[PDB]
Amino acid sequence: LSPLALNTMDQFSSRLIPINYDQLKKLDAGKQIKLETTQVSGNFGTKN
Amino acid sequence: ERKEAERIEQKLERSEKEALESYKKDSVEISKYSQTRNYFYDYQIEANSREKEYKELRNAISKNKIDKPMYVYYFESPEKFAFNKVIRTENQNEISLEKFNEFKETIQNKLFKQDGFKDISLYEPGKGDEKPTPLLMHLKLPRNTGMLPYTNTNNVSTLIEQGYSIKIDKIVRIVIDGKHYIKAEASVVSSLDFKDDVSKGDSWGKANYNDWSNKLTPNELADVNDYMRGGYTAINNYLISNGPVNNPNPELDSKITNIENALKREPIPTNLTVYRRSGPQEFGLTLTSPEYDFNKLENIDAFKSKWEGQALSYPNFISTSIGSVNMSAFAKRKIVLRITIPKGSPGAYLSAIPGYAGEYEVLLNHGSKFKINKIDSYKDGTITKLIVDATLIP
Numbered sequence: 001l002s003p004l005a006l007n008t009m010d011q012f013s014s015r016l017i018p019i020n021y022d023q024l025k026k027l028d029a030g031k032q033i034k035l036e037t038t039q040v041s042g043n044f045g046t047k048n
Numbered sequence: 049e050r051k052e053a054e055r056i057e058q059k060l061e062r063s064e065k066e067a068l069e070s071y072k073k074d075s076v077e078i079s080k081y082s083q084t085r086n087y088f089y090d091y092q093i094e095a096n097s098r099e100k101e102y103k104e105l106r107n108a109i110s111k112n113k114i115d116k117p118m119y120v121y122y123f124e125s126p127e128k129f130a131f132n133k134v135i136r137t138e139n140q141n142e143i144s145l146e147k148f149n150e151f152k153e154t155i156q157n158k159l160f161k162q163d164g165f166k167d168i169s170l171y172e173p174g175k176g177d178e179k180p181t182p183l184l185m186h187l188k189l190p191r192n193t194g195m196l197p198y199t200n201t202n203n204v205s206t207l208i209e210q211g212y213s214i215k216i217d218k219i220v221r222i223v224i225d226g227k228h229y230i231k232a233e234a235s236v237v238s239s240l241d242f243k244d245d246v247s248k249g250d251s252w253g254k255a256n257y258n259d260w261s262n263k264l265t266p267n268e269l270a271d272v273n274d275y276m277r278g279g280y281t282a283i284n285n286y287l288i289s290n291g292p293v294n295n296p297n298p299e300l301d302s303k304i305t306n307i308e309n310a311l312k313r314e315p316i317p318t319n320l321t322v323y324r325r326s327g328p329q330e331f332g333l334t335l336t337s338p339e340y341d342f343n344k345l346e347n348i349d350a351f352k353s354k355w356e357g358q359a360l361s362y363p364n365f366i367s368t369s370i371g372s373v374n375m376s377a378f379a380k381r382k383i384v385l386r387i388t389i390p391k392g393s394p395g396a397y398l399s400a401i402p403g404y405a406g407e408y409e410v411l412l413n414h415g416s417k418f419k420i421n422k423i424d425s426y427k428d429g430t431i432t433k434l435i436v437d438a439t440l441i442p
Contacts, residue, residue: 048060
């Protein structure tokens with residue numbers, strides 16, 4: 001399957017993620033954005 | 049604390065779920081069955097339609113415990129504290145100074161044991177709670193006790209099973225919403241007891257008293273075995289007949305002294321309760337006496353009036369059965385003595401040694417004093433038998 005899209009930043013998925021004009025220029029110069037994961041939430045199951 | 053209750057109810061499987069569901073609509077009758085369960089024969093305790101209910105309820109209660117002693121509170125009838133009267137009626141408000149005085153003097157030093165499922169709470173009885181009796185007791189449960197709260201349609205209540213004897217230090221008068229109540233502080237006393245654990249009781253006895261005979265000279269062991277094999281109906285009758293006063297003699301005094309020394313040699317390390325099926329002749333009553341007939345309520349009431357709280361003594365050699373089940377050899381006897389043996393008290397297990405030494409037979413010192421706490425009865429077929437909560441006094 002295809003990767004999922006992460007394009008919103010608020011709690012209700014209603015605001016997109018903006019960047020600056022200088023950051024846009026840096027992206028246009030060929031620079032790349034790196035994604036680092038800091039923590040992951042999740043649950044386990046307890047079986048009766 | 050419904051969050052904890054919903055956390056702890058999921059781990060219960062379907063059997064515990066059905067046990068608790070049956071409890072929630074029939075708490076009174078399941079409890080009433082729970083007090084009087086272990087005194088029947090070895091067959092009835094396996095052929096009833098509620099024995100499985102009792103077993104699975106005990107399993108559920110002992111599934112989850114408490115790591116520290118915490119206080120619990122509930123309403124107890126005065127009838128279980130050796131008080132056969134009523135302190136203050138439902139429609140009255142205040143209690144008399146006199147009634148307080150007899151109630152306090154009645155529970156000076158008397159330990160009472162409970163052995164059934166009951167409902168307790170962790171809070172003081174504020175508004176919105178029903179108040180069955182004018183008696184209020186604040187109970188202190190120890191570490192690692194059964195604790196399984198359950199929830200009703202709106203509120204939460206807890207259920208425990210008791211296997212201990214409780215002692216009340218002080219009682220005071222308090223006012224709750226315009227009525228006088230008695231507040232008692234009580235503590236839970238640790239001990240060991242085998243209601244139906246035949247295998248566990250046998251294991252405990254053999255574990256403790258297997259090394260008993262290793263400290264005794266062979267001659268004394270042979271003398272003890274011979275005396276318990278051949279002369280059990282002779283020396284006891286001699287002691288009952290007041291031998292030392294009427295016909296003093298050394299040939300039996302030596303036997304009495306040797307047996308007393310052997311029985312006093314090894315005290316118990318932990319409190320246990322032993323069951324003696326006492327005979328009517330022991331209380332000086334005969335099968336033809338009207339007071340002996342326990343079928344009617346008035347004879348039970350009279351025996352309780354004249355013997356609850358009184359002292360008892362056994363000039364003979366005391367023989368006790370650790371088992372609580374009715375035996376063929378002691379089937380016809382209506383009176384079972386519930387002797388509570390505290391730590392450091394005389395008593396030796398005689399079933400650890402090989403051979404058929406009797407029916408869980410245990411010998412104690414002659415002339416021992418006994419204290420009676422309460423006298424209660426249960427339905428046994430058509431007749432009603434009798435239980436006395438005897439206590440061993442040094």
